[PDB]
Design an enzyme around this catalytic site. Structure first.
Site, PDB file in Angstrom:
ATOM      1  N   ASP A   1       0.177  -1.636  -4.643  1.00 14.26           N
ATOM      2  CA  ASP A   1      -0.686  -2.616  -5.294  1.00 14.26           C
ATOM      3  C   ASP A   1      -2.162  -2.380  -5.007  1.00 14.26           C
ATOM      4  O   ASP A   1      -3.018  -3.078  -5.574  1.00 14.26           O
ATOM      5  CB  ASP A   1      -0.287  -4.052  -4.908  1.00 14.26           C
ATOM      6  CG  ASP A   1       0.001  -4.231  -3.409  1.00 14.26           C
ATOM      7  OD1 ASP A   1       0.229  -3.243  -2.687  1.00 14.26           O
ATOM      8  OD2 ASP A   1       0.043  -5.395  -2.976  1.00 14.26           O
TER       9      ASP A   1
ATOM     10  N   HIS B   1      -1.152  -7.008   8.040  1.00 11.63           N
ATOM     11  CA  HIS B   1      -0.200  -6.662   6.993  1.00 11.63           C
ATOM     12  C   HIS B   1       0.189  -5.185   7.051  1.00 11.63           C
ATOM     13  O   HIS B   1       1.349  -4.824   6.807  1.00 11.63           O
ATOM     14  CB  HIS B   1      -0.807  -7.017   5.636  1.00 11.63           C
ATOM     15  CG  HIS B   1      -0.049  -6.461   4.475  1.00 11.63           C
ATOM     16  ND1 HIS B   1       1.091  -7.058   3.972  1.00 11.63           N
ATOM     17  CD2 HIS B   1      -0.255  -5.351   3.726  1.00 11.63           C
ATOM     18  CE1 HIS B   1       1.537  -6.352   2.947  1.00 11.63           C
ATOM     19  NE2 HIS B   1       0.742  -5.311   2.780  1.00 11.63           N
TER      20      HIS B   1
HETATM   21  C1  LIG Z   1       3.185 -11.321  -2.004  1.00 13.40           C
HETATM   22  C2  LIG Z   1       4.607 -10.795  -2.216  1.00 13.40           C
HETATM   23  C3  LIG Z   1       4.914  -9.484  -1.494  1.00 13.40           C
HETATM   24  C4  LIG Z   1       6.378  -9.111  -1.725  1.00 13.40           C
HETATM   25  N1  LIG Z   1       4.061  -8.426  -2.005  1.00 13.40           N
HETATM   26  C5  LIG Z   1       4.204  -7.798  -3.163  1.00 13.40           C
HETATM   27  C6  LIG Z   1       3.173  -6.866  -3.260  1.00 13.40           C
HETATM   28  N2  LIG Z   1       2.452  -6.979  -2.154  1.00 13.40           N
HETATM   29  C7  LIG Z   1       2.988  -7.922  -1.394  1.00 13.40           C
HETATM   30  C8  LIG Z   1       2.442  -8.330  -0.027  1.00 13.40           C
HETATM   31  O1  LIG Z   1       3.165  -8.937   0.816  1.00 13.40           O
HETATM   32  O2  LIG Z   1       1.252  -8.040   0.254  1.00 13.40           O
HETATM   33 ZN   LIG Z   2       0.601  -4.051   1.177  1.00 11.45          ZN
HETATM   34 ZN   LIG Z   3       0.457  -6.640  -1.376  1.00  9.83          ZN
END
Ligand SMILES: CC[C@@H](C)n1ccnc1C(=O)O
Ligand SMILES: [Zn+2]
Ligand SMILES: [Zn+2]
Length: 231
Positions: A87, A148
Site C-alpha cells: 500500500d 507497524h
Molecule cells: C488497516 C487494515 C490492514 C489489514 N491493512 C491493510 C493494508 N494495510 C494495513 C495496515 O494494517 O496498515
Molecule cells: Zn504496512
Molecule cells: Zn497499511
C-alpha cells in the site's frame, strides 16, 4: 466529509484538501476478504507537488496521477514511500515511468527487495536511527523507531501543522490491530511516544487508513497496540 471506503470504488481515487497546499489521497483495495481505504499525502512544493505513498497498486496509482492532474494540475516531481508494504510502494513503477523521482530510506528499499515489492529508486539518508529527522522540501521526514514495521516513517508538514502517521497510526474507529506480521509490538508505544514528543504542535493527524483526527490518534493507537499485545 472525508471519503469513506463505502463511497470509493476500488479503482477510483479521491482527494481531500486538508489545508492550503496539502491534500490527502484516498484509494480502496480488496485484501484478505475485505475492502480497506488507504491514505497518502500530497504537498505543494512551489509549482510542483511532493507525493507521499502510492495509492496501493499500479492501477490505483495511475488513477491518482490522473486525479491530481484533473483537480490540481501541477506535476508530481518527487514521491516518498513511508514503508516497504504494497500500500506504500505498489505503484512506484507507474510513478517512475511518469518521470516522478521515487524515494525511500535504505531500510525500506532493503525490505522491499527482500519481500518482492517495488523498490523506490532514490535513498533517503539520515533516518536509520530512532528519533532521526531530515528535511525534504516542504515536509520533515521522521523515523520514530519500529512500530507497524521496522522502517516506517512519518511525515510532518510544518506550514500546515499536518502530521501524516502512515500505518503506524490507527484511526479512532479501528479497535483491533491490523496487519502486525512485520510489526514490533514491544517498541510500538515507545515509537509513538517519540512522535508525540517531536510533533506536539500537530493539529491534523492522518492515519495510514481511515479518518483523520488530532493527536489523540496517537494515544488511541498505543491503547489498541497494548490491548493486542495483551491478547
Ligand atoms: C488497516 C487494515 C490492514 C489489514 N491493512 C491493510 C493494508 N494495510 C494495513 C495496515 O494494517 O496498515
Ligand atoms: Zn504496512
Ligand atoms: Zn497499511
Amino acid at each position: 466529509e472525508y471519503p469513506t471506503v463505502s463511497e470509493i470504488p476500488v479503482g477510483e481515487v479521491r482527494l481531500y484538501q486538508i489545508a492550503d497546499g496539502v491534500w490527502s489521497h484516498i484509494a480502496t483495495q480488496s485484501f484478505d476478504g475485505a475492502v480497506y481505504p488507504s491514505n497518502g499525502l500530497i504537498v505543494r512544493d512551489g509549482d510542483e507537488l511532493l507525493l507521499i505513498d502510492t495509492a496501493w497498486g499500479a492501477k490505483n496509482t495511475a488513477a491518482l496521477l490522473a486525479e491530481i492532474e484533473k483537480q490540481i494540475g501541477l506535476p508530481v516531481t518527487r514521491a516518498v514511500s513511508t514503508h516497504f508494504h504494497d500500500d506504500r510502494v505498489g505503484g512506484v513503477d507507474v510513478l517512475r515511468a511518469a518521470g516522478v523521482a521515487t524515494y525511500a530510506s535504505p531500510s525500506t528499499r532493503r525490505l522491499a527487495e527482500v519481500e518482492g515489492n517495488e523498490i523506490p529508486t532514490h535513498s533517503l539518508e539520515g533516518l536509520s536511527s530512532s528519533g532521526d529527522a531530515v528535511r525534504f522540501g516542504p515536509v520533515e521526514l521522521f523515523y520514530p523507531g519500529a512500530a507497524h514495521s521496522t522502517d516506517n516513517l512519518v511525515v510532518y508538514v510544518p506550514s500546515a501543522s499536518v502530521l501524516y502517521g502512515g500505518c503506524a497510526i490507527y484511526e479512532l474507529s479501528r479497535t483491533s490491530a491490523g496487519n502486525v506480521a512485520d510489526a514490533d509490538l514491544a517498541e510500538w508505544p515507545t515509537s509513538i511516544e517519540r512522535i508525540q514528543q517531536h510533533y506536539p504542535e500537530a493539529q491534523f493527524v492522518i492515519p495510514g487508513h481511515g479518518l483523520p483526527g488530532g493527536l489523540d490518534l496517537l494515544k488511541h493507537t498505543t491503547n489498541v497496540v497494548k490491548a493486542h499485545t495483551n491478547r
